[PDB]
Amino acid sequence: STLEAEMAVERKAVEDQRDGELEARAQKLEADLAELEAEGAKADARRKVRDGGEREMRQIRDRAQRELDRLEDIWSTFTKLAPKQLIVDENLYRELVD
């Protein structure tokens, strides 16, 4: 019970910060775009700015998702722990130990 409770609580650190980093980067990009559109700038420049901003947004979402699923995986493994099971990660083992 408390195990799954603490797992959920950590999922909270996963979710809030996943949303927050993306929010910050998006705010920065939108400010930079409102600045670029304030002056007279070529439309190709704005298109490339938007492309880079989408790249950054998706990259942040991926950096989140990857760790989120990794943490799901550690719990999934911990659940099915029974003797004679062979662990090969050599890092997951440390997470399970500590």
What share of residues are in beta strands?
Answer: under 5%
Ends apart, CA distance between termini: 19 Å
Silhouette: elongated
Quaternary: part of a larger assembly
**How many H/I helices?**
3
Mind telling me the C-alpha Rg?
20 Å
Overall helicity: over 70%
Question: What is the N-to-C succession of helices and strands?
Answer: HHH
Subunit structure: The RNAP catalytic core consists of 2 alpha, 1 beta, 1 beta' and 1 omega subunit. When a sigma factor is associated with the core the holoenzyme is formed, which can initiate transcription.
Function: DNA-dependent RNA polymerase catalyzes the transcription of DNA into RNA using the four ribonucleoside triphosphates as substrates.
Family: Belongs to the RNA polymerase beta' chain family.
Coiled coil: 19-74
Describe, in plain words, how this protein is organized in 3D:
With 98 residues, this protein is mostly helical. The chain has helices spanning 2-36, 43-79, 92-97. It is elongated and about 70 Å long. The RNAP catalytic core consists of 2 alpha, 1 beta, 1 beta' and 1 omega subunit. When a sigma factor is associated with the core the holoenzyme is formed, which can initiate transcription. Residues 19-74 form a coiled coil. Belongs to the RNA polymerase beta' chain family.
How are the SSEs ordered, and which strands pair?
Blueprint: H1 2-36, H2 43-79, H3 92-97
PDB class: transcription/dna/antibiotic
Keywords: RNA Polymerase, Antibiotic, Inhibitor, transcription
Entry title: Mtb RNAP Holo/RbpA/Fidaxomicin/upstream fork DNA
Short description:
The protein has helices spanning 2-36, 43-79, 92-97. It is an all-alpha fold and 98 residues long.
